[PDB]
């Protein structure tokens, strides 16, 4: 009745197509983000190799710029478009104001794009939610989340995608100032959280870190194996 | 049956029913008649007075679309006023380009084509107005034209539009307009309008008349009130 067009409000004022896009996000692979004191760690599950596929082509985590990166859960093609648009906006902002982009600026831009696609019929919402991580000029860690609706919110730590409810409950339990004390502890926290919802530990998680003034580093599979081994042993 | 919803559509039996539905619009209107005689063309309208509050000389259905032509309308007054603006624009453009007053046949053809544009496209409805146009020029002579919502245009020695079209047409038919002169034709127009007016259904009317002819030196104008009063008294007397 009222779920076929984005423009039409429902009785009780629910816009339902954007809700359906938010539901589409839930289908996607899990992603998790956590703010350490000097690190921001972004972890994403890997669906499966399929044994005849090249892993390099598929990468959920991406770097918008030197100081900002994102991970997504939702439609992969839409994510690719949004990533490219945010990258060109990053370089354009540097061009315009001779300064590097702030994490809140880029998440605002991505949210504005998603909002622009929601408002008008003849265009469908981007079926993605994103986890944007970066370090600002002051050096404070920043974690933001975006959704198809176009609202953005800072999170100390969060998850998106399938099993987001379970892993975020686990993270609400586990997260504390103590865990954020160590960079290795932050990485281990996100690894344990993804382990809460994933078939196998090392094979099916792709993880990355950003340090205070370093570029994004996708942790090697051997490093992830070492960290899960340390996590597994402690239990 | 979804054939009648749009004017782009055709009925399976070859009928565009939206246009006919728009033709039914004018029949809601109060009657209006125009008669052509040797000297010129006389127009008359039965303007029903909906309320005492409304000012006299308001809701005018007789428009001047150029100095030498006048327009009388039946159907939706909004569409009619818009069509009058279109006709005035066409006449002004004709004067500006070709350097002289527009021939009535050509003006009728252009406004009729503008009307006919709307019957084709789905986005926009047909006009809800049927209107008569009349002019006198020493070269062309007296000319009376009527345009339906379809965009059909024809020349009428006498014409009627609106609710009482058929009765008005027989009354006009028994007139011999060709020999007659305008100052008599105003009286007979008043007679016909008073006849066709239904006192029971329609509470009251104020006769609105105009003419164009040699007596005006070829300018359409509203009737002088003395002549209006004379014609109205004659119509009331003849009504019995």
């Amino acid at each position: 009745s009222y779920d076929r067009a984005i423009t039409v409000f429902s009785p009780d004022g629910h816009l339902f197509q954007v809700e359906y896009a938010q539901e589409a996000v839930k289908k996607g692979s899990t992603a998790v983000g956590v703010r350490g004191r000097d690190i921001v760690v972004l972890g994403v599950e890997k669906k499966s190799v399929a044994k005849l596929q090249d892993e390099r082509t598929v990468r959920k985590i991406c770097a918008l710029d030197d100081n900002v990166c994102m991970a997504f859960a939702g439609l992969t093609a839409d994510a690719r478009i949004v990533i490219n648009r945010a990258r060109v906006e990053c370089q354009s902002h540097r061009l315009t104001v001779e300064d590097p982009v702030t994490v809140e600026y880029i998440t605002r831009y991505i949210a504005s794009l998603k909002q622009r696609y929601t408002q008008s019929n003849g265009r469908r919402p981007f079926g993605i939610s994103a986890l944007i991580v970066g370090f600002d000029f002051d050096g404070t860690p920043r974690l933001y989340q975006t959704d198809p609706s176009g609202t953005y919110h800072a999170w100390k730590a969060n998850a998106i995608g399938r099993g987001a409810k379970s892993v975020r409950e686990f993270l609400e339990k586990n997260y504390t100032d103590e865990a954020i004390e160590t960079d290795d502890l932050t990485i281990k926290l996100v690894i344990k959280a993804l382990l809460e919802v994933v078939q196998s530990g090392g094979k099916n998680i792709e993880l990355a870190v950003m340090r205070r003034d370093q570029s994004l580093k996708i942790l090697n599979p051997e490093e992830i194996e070492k960290y899960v081994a340390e996590i597994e042993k402690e239990k | 049956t979804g054939y009648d919803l749009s004017a782009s559509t055709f009925s399976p039996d070859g009928r565009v029913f939206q246009v006919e539905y728009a033709m039914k619009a004018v029949e809601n209107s109060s009657t209006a008649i125009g008669i052509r005689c040797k000297d010129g063309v006389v127009f008359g309208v039965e303007k029903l007075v909906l309320s005492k509050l409304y000012e006299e000389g308001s809701n005018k259905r007789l428009f001047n679309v150029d100095r030498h032509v006048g327009m009388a309308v039946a159907g939706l007054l909004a569409d009619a006023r818009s069509l009058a603006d279109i006709a005035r624009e066409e006449a002004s453009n004709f004067r500006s380009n070709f350097g002289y007053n527009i021939p009535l046949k050509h003006l009728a053809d252009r406004v009729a084509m503008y009307v006919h544009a709307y019957t084709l496209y789905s986005a926009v409805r047909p006009f809800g107005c049927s209107f008569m146009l009349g002019s006198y020029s020493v070269n062309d002579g007296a000319q009376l034209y009527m345009i339906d919502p379809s965009g059909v245009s024809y020349g009428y020695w006498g014409c009627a539009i609106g609710k009482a079209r058929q009765a008005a047409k027989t009354e006009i038919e028994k007139l011999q307009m060709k020999e007659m002169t305008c100052r008599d034709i105003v009286k007979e127009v008043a007679k016909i309008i008073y006849i066709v007016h239904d006192e029971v259904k329609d509470k009251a009317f104020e006769l609105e008349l105009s003419w164009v002819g040699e007596l005006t030196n070829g300018r359409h104008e509203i009737v002088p009130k003395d002549i209006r009063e004379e014609a109205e008294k004659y119509a009331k007397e003849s009504l019995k």
Binding site: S1, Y2, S10, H14, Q22, E23, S129, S149, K165 | -
Partner: protein, 217 residues
């Protein structure tokens, strides 16, 4: 509405009992009943091949062309098979009632959209109501058998010269046996169909509206 603590306790008790009983039924009772009815139809009595084995004597004195009828028993085979079947049909009707109530209590607040989950709930409700009507039909025909056979034997005794009533009594018994084996087959099929549909759509049944949204509001 204002509720006492005792009222809330009573309602929550009914709710938790219904949920746990539905879980127990579909996970445990349904497989057990499926195999029980399966072995029962595999039983030799239900698979009688020669129907003249089923027909039982009616001691109506045939009228010689020109004294009284002794006690005319019911068909032992058919009544024993009926004694087996009747618990099963009544049990299935009870369990379908339980499933209906479980799904209905799981129906959420009425809402403008996200009604696909409640649509699934309505579809499975349509199916369970259909099997409910079917088992009610079974329950009435089992009584129709007794009433019809009694009327038939009464007619045969009253009009001895008519043999068509005697043939009718035998035919009622045979048709009853056929109906009973089809019945146990249908009961097993209904248990299995309930299991399949509920197990397949349990996620939307238990949680129709779904997980909480990001709350753009």
């Amino acid at each position: 509405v204002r509720l006492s603590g005792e009222a809330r306790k009573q309602v929550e008790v009914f709710r938790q009992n219904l949920f746990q009983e539905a879980e127990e039924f579909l996970y445990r009772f349904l497989p057990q009943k499926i195999i029980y009815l399966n072995q029962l139809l595999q039983e030799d009595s239900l698979n009688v091949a020669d129907l003249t084995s089923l027909r039982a004597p009616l001691d109506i004195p045939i009228p010689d062309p020109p004294h009284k009828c002794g006690f005319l028993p019911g068909n032992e085979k058919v009544l024993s098979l009926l004694a087996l079947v009747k618990p099963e049909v009544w049990t299935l009707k009870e369990k379908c009632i339980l499933v209906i109530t479980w799904i209905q209590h799981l129906i959420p607040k009425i809402e403008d959209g996200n009604d696909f989950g409640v649509a699934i709930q309505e579809k499975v409700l349509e199916r369970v109501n259909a099997v409910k009507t079917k088992v009610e039909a079974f329950q009435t025909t089992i009584s129709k058998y007794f009433s019809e056979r009694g009327d038939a034997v009464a007619k045969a005794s009253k009009e001895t010269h008519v043999m068509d009533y005697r043939a009718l009594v035998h035919e009622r018994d045979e048709a009853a046996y056929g109906e009973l084996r089809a019945m146990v087959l249908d009961l097993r099929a209904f248990y299995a169909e309930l299991y399949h549909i509920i197990s397949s759509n349990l996620e939307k049944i238990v949680n129709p509206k779904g997980e909480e949204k990001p709350s753009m509001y």
